[PDB]
């Protein structure tokens, strides 16, 4: 008998970096998905295992809204079965993903003049991320034979790197705000429905 707080995630003033993506747990509310699919301000709206129009008739136990910022080049990586720096080391979706990937250009907000360096992405990691894994480490990555001891140098690099957003960038290098909705249906009472 209410309306879910989907406005807190999409219309959020600040978004997190992709390596440290932010998850919002959605439960016990009435979800009006007509606000999303009827919005013409989205550049990407890909749903897997469900239909956008055929979602107000469904009920779910829990819904997970993941939000972060990436390049336009890396929007194709937010999908099942993709590889790359984002899919391998920052945000990984499973092969059996059930949800929708939504993204839109945020050059006007997340690209500063002089260079916005607050958004980061993980550049080095020993192994790929498991689905929905979140690595926030800053240990000095060892890419050589000698050990590092937590100091930068030859083959000892900082694992995170900055995007340095600026409006003059090409669209593939401009910031894009991504919201990933995960629909979960367990052997529990379903709390998130539609109209």
């Amino acid at each position: 008998t209410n309306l879910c707080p989907f406005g807190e995630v999409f219309n959020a003033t600040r978004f997190a970096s992709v390596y440290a993506w932010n998850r919002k747990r959605i439960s016990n509310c009435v979800a009006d998905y007509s606000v999303l699919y009827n919005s013409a301000s989205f550049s990407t709206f890909k749903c897997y295992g469900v239909s956008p129009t055929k979602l107000n008739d469904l009920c779910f136990t829990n819904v997970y809204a993941d939000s972060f910022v990436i390049r336009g080049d890396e929007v194709r990586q937010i999908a099942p079965g993709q590889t790359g720096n984002i899919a391998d080391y920052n945000y990984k979706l499973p092969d059996d993903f059930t949800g929708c990937v939504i993204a839109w250009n945020s050059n006007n907000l997340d690209s500063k003049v002089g260079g916005n360096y607050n958004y980061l992405y993980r550049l080095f990691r020993k192994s790929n991320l498991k689905p929905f894994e979140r690595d926030i480490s800053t240990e000095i990555y060892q890419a050589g034979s000698t050990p590092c001891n937590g100091v930068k140098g030859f083959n000892c690099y900082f694992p995170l790197q900055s995007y340095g957003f600026q409006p003059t960038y090409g669209v593939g290098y401009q910031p894009y705000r991504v919201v990933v909705l995960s629909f979960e249906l367990l052997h529990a009472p379903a709390t998130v429905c539609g109209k």
Partner: antibody
Framework: QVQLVQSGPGLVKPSQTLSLTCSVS??????????WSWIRQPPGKGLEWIGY???????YYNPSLKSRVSISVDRSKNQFSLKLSSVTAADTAVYYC???????????????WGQGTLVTVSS | SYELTQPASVSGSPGQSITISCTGT?????????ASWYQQHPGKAPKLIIY???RRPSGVSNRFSGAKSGNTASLTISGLQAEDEADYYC??????????FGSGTKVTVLG
């Protein structure tokens, strides 16, 4: 290709305000892909970046001159100008305007350049 | 640090190769914040030779090549010619704040 034509007085008295204007031909200054900067070079010395301006009005100056520098843009007249206040003999230099390209975090460069305007600060 | 360091002068023989160093402190990884290089002849405005570390503008001779050894960018001029005698400046975005040019390198063709 693009062309930058500089203009302005070659003599500015001490404590006065240096004022220069750079006009863009064979290209629109209202391009979302480019910055419009000023670079100066004292005679016989090196190059110093002063600051640039976006076509919307946003500016980003060298903090070593931020207190004295004011860069404006006029997209209707396809020009952008420079103003340096409280000039001294240390400000006598050849001043250049250049298109600043920043398409990605890979790199950035200045191309093309104005032909240079020598401004002498003297009494 | 911010001051970008170049050799004051370098020299080489005609038809040979020379390399100009550009030393800074900001250690960027890989294809990130790649420097640029400029040629200035007396009484002329600077001319872009190298951008994004190694790419060249159209019309610039292939005798010019750029590289980087992690900490230092390098401009290499093969087959030295008399007109290559000029001043050369590297440029980079240092400390994610200001644009700095190198100290300046005066190339003199020997012989």
């Amino acid at each position: 290709q693009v062309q930058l034509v500089q203009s302005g007085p070659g003599l500015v008295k001490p404590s006065q305000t240096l004022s220069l204007t750079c006009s863009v031909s064979d290209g629109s200054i209202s391009s979302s892909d480019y910055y419009w900067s000023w670079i100066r070079q004292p005679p016989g010395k090196g190059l110093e970046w002063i600051g640039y301006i976006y076509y919307t009005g946003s500016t980003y100056y060298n903090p070593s001159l931020k207190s004295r520098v004011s860069i404006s843009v006029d997209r209707s007249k396809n020009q952008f100008s420079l103003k340096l206040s409280s000039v001294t003999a240390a400000d006598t230099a050849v001043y250049y305007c250049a298109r600043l390209v920043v398409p990605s975090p890979k790199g950035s460069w200045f191309d093309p350049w104005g032909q240079g305007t020598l401004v002498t600060v003297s009494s | 640090s911010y001051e970008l360091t170049q050799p004051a002068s370098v020299s080489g023989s005609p038809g040979q190769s020379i390399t100009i160093s550009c030393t800074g402190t900001s250690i960027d990884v890989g294809n990130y914040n790649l420097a640029s290089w400029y040629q200035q002849h007396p009484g002329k405005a600077p001319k872009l030779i190298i951008y994004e570390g190694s790419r060249r503008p159209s019309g610039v001779s292939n005798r010019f090549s750029g590289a980087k050894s992690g900490n230092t960018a390098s401009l290499t001029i093969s087959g030295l010619q008399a007109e290559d005698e000029a001043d050369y400046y590297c440029c980079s975005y240092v400390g994610s704040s200001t644009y700095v040019f190198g100290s300046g390198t005066k190339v003199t063709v020997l012989g």
